[PDB]
Symmetry: C3
Subunit: 457 residues, 3 copies
């Protein structure tokens, strides 16, 4: 049932190997695009597909955090000399064992002297004492990870096909992994060890996830899911305006990172009426419940170049970022006297549909859907709705399926492709200019979505 | 009046296209440098110039800020039990409507009990109450933007020239835009749709503006100008040591981001004499007036690789960074039996002038000015003032004008080209070594320029 | 005594130069790997070695810091109206000249009223006054530097060898420096100015040190050593959780950056017993002594791609980062009718040894040591301990020595090469598959090493 991939139209360069003071060897060179295949015969169809481009980021930091659910409760004393409510009992201290404590809860104390005698005698200088309690919100736990500069790997699929009877028969299928950060990587590619595959990257990948703090939900069983990015603290940092200040210890117990010491800086309270036991209370912090947390969607949902961004396995040592968009790699195929012949299939497209989108994260793109398409498809973006209007941008899209297929794809657009409807014309490689499919594509701009008082008694 | 560009000396690689099970096609391959042109005839002179290399960064955050002009005014009460000056009236509160308010001003209160009875009786425990007022300084408004990982575009200029009579005649002129982050981008380049242009980048651009917070002045009419970089807060951050804590709301009203809550942390005051109504007051913050703000020059002025860095248009969705310095792109020109012949013009230079500069931002460079020059010019930096001294560095500069022209350019230098005068010799491509112009170039090192108490009653 | 380097097996591409309207020139093109050499004869053996790949980062910020040794001493007054211990004497003030001061020490005051009358009468409201002293710990001084976006330089070694009698004789040896960030860099390479060397990078280097704050120890004589990275403040930042808040002025005197103003925010104290003069005291800060500092090892020790990362010289303007791992560069050698012939030497390996390591910083690698090896060595990593088990990864290693030599090297591994022992098979370029050396390599995973209360009277 196995069929070959679309054999891409590629220019080949004849390279001649250097000579040694013994016994010349010819090599075939070409650039291979990400998600494309190259086919050749040897004088059994051999196919090389660039399946994956990945960044393997070492995880240099790890801590477990949650979203705190905060409740503060205060008591006022009208008389500043009262034995009740003191810096001894409420300043730089956790709530006592005697103070009604839930197992999952963490409780820190605050002390506010120099209150106004509302509810007291004119000469009283009240003091307000508080318990600030933190609970894990909806038992939502997250793993915080520092991702550093990655190593780059390309995964190729080598498949060999024989055309026995009237159907294609898959004879060989192997996955070839090659490191991209250094020099040329070489290996044998066929079962007979006759054909060799050399891979060479020209510099860094066009994209990379920036060194920094990322995180994912931790679940029952398969702990980690897709990584996300939201302002988050490094292990040694304790900025209450960022995620991660509500940390989990060796046991599954959450605490406010340096809570006892920091509480007086974050919790701010003032009396309303001392007698009536009423007050104003706030938490000069971010990412807590109620009303101070909104979880960002994963990286792969919000960033078009990211196909996937996940922690590799349960050892939590590497984060693997799989690329949706990436530049070509340089390939060199070397091997009695034999002939290596490269083959490609024709490109087709029946029709297309789409919309020009400017998403809530400012990504300018053409959401393209092709119909009964395969191969290299050249697109041209026009100045207006008229098909004959000036070309403002040109691009090429590549369809993977050997048979004509219906597929969706994101084409990034330059800032010149501004507001309003315009024509986009698509033509398959080596088809008359008359054989182009033009359409008026509608424009959809989502407004920029971005983030950013006192509670009673 | 239109004349062609200098046709660059380029090596060409014969590539042969793969074959399909129908009906071989030859391609011409070469590397094109940024700001260079390549010329060819078809068997009407066709020219391809790599005009621009650009990064289109999506703008993921936006807020408007200004520079606050701060004035604090305090009143002291000798008696701690006085109805005047309390935590009710001055702690965690904006100044009242009754408290003399300018429309453009924002006013926050501070409360300082436990003062020393200087100006009172020995047993008094004074309290100091303050109004901390903020005004926009010189009505200077700025837009803060978060720039994320860009998409890359090359702009080429294709021009066709006929030599009718005794003058060059420009027959065709189009701008070709090509995306660099993915695979090979292809399009038709001539009016007759006979010639095709494939563009391929080998990885990321040698330069990129780092993901982060940038900003520009906002003006009357054409809102935004050149982008700048200075320590600046992300929308969800509120670090008083960085720009952006003085924000503008829906109306043109500026406020201290979380002012009511944060004032007691930033404003610090102490009595001098309670009776005399004198005090010490400071703002533990940065980027305010008087004496705490110094505006950084734009990115393109301070960073030699940046030609321009601007917000694209009034929709404020993309920032366009135009590159002054960038690596070459791989080009492949494909098409009865016709012959494609590449042509170049000779390189010349009459003389040169310059100085070796180490600017206030530590950029080590040769400020080069060429005279009656055109094309490829090879430079060599020497160990001493002697022309015959050891070569310590070699470089190539490219002059765009078809006719010999006078032009200025920045050549970056490695750390080996340290202090003191030295010889620099310049030779145009394919000129005798005798035909080199040597000069003793003077060295100019600017010291590193970098940034970083109590006011009375 | 000088011997040539191992001449690498390289494929050559015939390029033809464009033509001018005067009097064609053939060029030889190939990719050169970092730490490899290419040899050719001219119709005296000419060798080109890519010796170094370097980033020259401009230093945009500089300040000198140390590690503070903190001691706090407090005195309590039972009576809040006492002339002794006031906001005048202890709030927002350095310790007086009269207050026993060491020349190297810096002393800041804190004031804590509203204490509990432990050791006093029931109606007393004690006040606690402190001196917080800072000393340089072990006179350890560091230089903090901001490293910005670098310029890239390749250093080549051109050597010419004659084989006179029975020994190799080194006739010429020069170091060629070439900038990588822009277009093709060209120069003459032989003494006779007959051979030219053009160098072209395809994009940015596969690695780069991220723009940010770095630092090194400052010593007697040769001031700076290897750079390090640990959370560190920018010159305008003053985050007490990061390094650099303990700064050195024009003279060799250390101070707490904005100490007078910030002390009340960082130093937190509470009375134990007023009469007994006992208290609790802490410093809500990081990177101080005792017990709050642990120095990170240099970048080159912890990051496998970094060979060296140092400040260039005493002017402190550039940081040079030398790369251990980097992608290939494109080379083009151009020149009566003469013939250019490229030569390579055979590849050999007697045996190998190693271990698969996952270090304390999450780097996954094969610590490879080769025996009597030279040239291109192809490696294959297996699924299990069995030599015939499925290949999970393939790589190529390059040995520099012309003679068979014993050398250690780090091969990075993809996340697929998880826990447990497995076979690794090594084969030299153009040796039978039978001529491979397989070994069962043991796995060593170091746990992730990462960083992150009250003192008595
Ligand atoms: C795609 O390309 C291949 C190679 O050009 C096509 O041809 C098959 O393979 C060899 C030629 O290399 C022939 O001997 C076979 O007879 C071909 N198979 C068939 C089914 O004709 C292949 O057919 C192409 N596939 C499509 C879908 O067009
Ligand atoms: C630069 O290069 C072109 C091409 O080599 C020069 O030649 C012109 O173009 C064709 C050759 O391709 C000739 O038929 C024309 O007669 C040439 N024009 C002239 C003015 O002679 C062109 O002249 C060169 N320009 C300069 C300034 O040297
Ligand atoms: C490595 O390569 C060179 C070139 O192939 C070897 O050959 C020497 O150089 C020329 C050929 O270019 C001969 O005329 C010399 O006679 C060769 N020298 C010797 C010692 O035979 C060179 O020998 C090789 N080195 C090794 C260690 O194998
Ligand atoms: C593109 O449109 C298709 C429907 O035609 C939809 O499934 C897909 O999610 C859209 N993608 C984006 C990024 O809007
Ligand atoms: C280079 O010198 C010219 C004058 O010769 C001047 O216009 C230019 O601004 C200088 N550039 C720098 C970066 O110093
Ligand atoms: C690799 O092993 C050798 C000893 O065989 C040792 O000298 C070297 O430091 C090791 N390197 C690492 C990174 O473990």
């Amino acid at each position: 049932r196995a069929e070959p991939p679309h054999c891409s139209k590629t220019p080949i360069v004849r390279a001649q190997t250097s000579q040694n003071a013994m016994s010349r060897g010819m090599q075939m060179q070409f650039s291979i695009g990400l998600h494309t295949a190259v086919c050749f015969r040897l004088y059994l169809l051999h196919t090389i597909r660039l399946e994956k481009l990945e960044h393997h980021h070492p995880i240099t930091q790890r801590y477990t955090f949650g979203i705190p659910e905060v409740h503060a409760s205060c008591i006022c004393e009208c008389d500043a000399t009262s034995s009740t409510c003191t810096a001894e009992s409420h300043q730089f201290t956790a709530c006592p064992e005697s103070d009604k404590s839930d197992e999952t809860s963490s409780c820190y104390r605050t002390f506010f002297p120099n209150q106004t005698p509302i509810g007291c005698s004119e000469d009283d200088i009240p003091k307000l004492c508080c318990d600030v309690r933190f609970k894990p919100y909806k038992n939502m736990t997250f793993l915080a990870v520092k991702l550093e500069q990655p190593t780059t790997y390309a995964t190729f699929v080598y498949a060999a096909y024989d055309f026995v009877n009237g159907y294609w028969v898959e004879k060989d299928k192997t996955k070839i992994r090659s490191q991209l950060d250094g020099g040329t990587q070489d290996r044998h590619l066929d079962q007979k060890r006759r054909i060799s595959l050399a891979v060479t990257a020209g510099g860094r990948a066009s994209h990379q996830l920036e060194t920094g703090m990322y995180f994912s939900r931790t679940s029952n069983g398969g702990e980690t899911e897709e990584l996300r990015m939201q302002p988050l603290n490094e292990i040694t940092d304790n900025n209450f305006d960022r995620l991660g200040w509500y940390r989990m210890d060796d046991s599954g117990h959450f605490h406010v990172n340096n809570g006892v010491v920091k509480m007086d800086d974050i919790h701010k309270a003032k009396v309303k009426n001392c007698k009536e036991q009423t007050y104003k209370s706030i938490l000069s912090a971010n990412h807590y419940m109620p009303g101070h947390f909104n979880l960002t969607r994963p990286l792969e949902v919000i960033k078009p170049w990211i196909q996937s961004a996940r922690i590799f396995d349960s050892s939590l040592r590497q984060a693997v970022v799989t690329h949706a968009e990436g530049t070509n790699l340089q390939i060199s195929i070397h091997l009695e006297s034999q002939n290596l012949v490269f083959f490609h299939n024709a490109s087709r497209i029946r029709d297309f549909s789409g919309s020009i989108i400017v998403d809530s994260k400012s990504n300018r793109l053409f959401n393209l859907t092709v119909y009964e398409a395969s191969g290299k498809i050249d697109g041209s973006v026009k100045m207006s709705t008229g098909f004959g209007s000036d070309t403002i941008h040109t691009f090429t899209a590549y369809v993977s399926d050997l048979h004509a297929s219906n597929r969706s794809m994101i084409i990034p657009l330059p800032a010149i492709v501004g507001q309003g409807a315009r024509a986009i014309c698509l033509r398959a490689d080596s088809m008359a200019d008359i054989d182009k499919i033009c359409h008026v594509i509608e424009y959809f701009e989502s407004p920029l979505f971005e983030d950013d008082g006192w509670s009673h008694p």
